[PDB]
Amino acid sequence: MMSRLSWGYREHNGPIHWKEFFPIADGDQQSPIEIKTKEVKYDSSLRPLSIKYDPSSAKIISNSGHSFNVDFDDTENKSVLRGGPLTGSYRLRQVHLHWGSADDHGSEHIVDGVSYAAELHVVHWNSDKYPSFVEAAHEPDGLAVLGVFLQIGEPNSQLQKITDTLDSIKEKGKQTRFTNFDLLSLLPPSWDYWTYPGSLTVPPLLESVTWIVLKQPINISSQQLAKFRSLLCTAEGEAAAFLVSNHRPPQPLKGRKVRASFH
Ligand SMILES: NS(=O)(=O)c1c(F)c(F)c(SCCO)c(F)c1NC1CCCCCCC1
Ligand SMILES: [Zn+2]
């Protein structure tokens, strides 16, 4: 059933039920959103984006029950996001992915009505101001998240390191060592983006995120994507259930405006 500790994406515990235990779900700065490009303005004051990523920063991949999570050594500043809308240095913490039960939709953000098959989130936190991820996640300027769309297309070799691990992390709670990960090369060639203030897209739905949603999708094949749907949302010894869909619908803008890095 729905509860604070048992949210998910199934019928009784899914997105439409999260407000029962996390009433910020219906807040003013929730994510994801629909981006209406005719109402987006270019902002010349955005600085160039800076992405410095060290493959050795990756440590572990795990099944959270809600996605896979690649966790990074966030003790140093070897892997950091700077520039764009951001003030100061945002340290890489996590990568995870959202998908739907079928290829036609599953992205979280939706651009002029267009959905993609999946969406990668790359989570960073403001280590110039805050002492930990966990503390940054409660501040409006605390987190910076890159969103990358995945469109069905020819298989993507850059996803192999991830897909090779999925059997080892089938059950919720399993983890496996995962280092030397080339994240940079899972970004599209163009880093043109939209930016707006929003939230985590899972409980606790905290309104602490500067979203940076890249316009250009990367590819994934249907065969590759289907492997993610074979992860379980359930732990060893719990009746099995598959994580066939794990995307939150867009939430209303409720007055926020979205800026473009490009014109
Ligand atoms: N490292 S962590 O487990 O704290 C964590 C991430 F690394 C993340 F990148 C995120 S982003 C959305 C989930 O995938 C996260 F929510 C949490 N968890 C939330 C847990 C509730 C505790 C307070 C802080 C909010 C983050
Ligand atoms: Zn996410």
UniProtKB/Swiss-Prot annotation:
Tissue-level expression: Expressed in thymus, small intestine, spleen, prostate, ovary, colon and testis.
Give me the segments passing through the membrane: none
**UniProt-listed Enzyme Commission number(s):** 4.2.1.1
Alphabetic keyword roster: Lyase, Metal-binding, Zinc
Amino-acid positions noted as binding Zn(2+) in the UniProt annotation, renumbered to this chain: H96, H98, H121
- Annotated residues that bind substrate are located at T201, V202
Free-text activity regulation comment from the record: Inhibited by acetazolamide.
Domain of life of the source: Eukaryota
GO cellular component entries? cytoplasm; cytosol; intracellular membrane-bounded organelle; myelin sheath
Any idea where the Alpha-carbonic anhydrase domain is? 5-262
Which PROSITE patterns is this protein grouped with? Answer: ALPHA_CA_1 (PS00162), ALPHA_CA_2 (PS51144)
Give the reaction(s) catalysed: hydrogencarbonate + H(+) = CO2 + H2O
SUPFAM superfamilies given for it? Carbonic anhydrase
- Keyword Glycoprotein listed? The answer is no
* Tagged with keyword Lyase: yes
Kindly list the GO molecular function terms attached to this UniProt entry: carbonate dehydratase activity; zinc ion binding
Catalytic site positions: H66 (proton donor/acceptor)
Cofactor(s) it depends on: Zn(2+)
Q: Which family does it belong to?
A: Belongs to the alpha-carbonic anhydrase family.
Instruction: Say what the protein does.
Output: Reversible hydration of carbon dioxide.
Protein known as = Carbonic anhydrase 13
Organism, scientific name: Homo sapiens
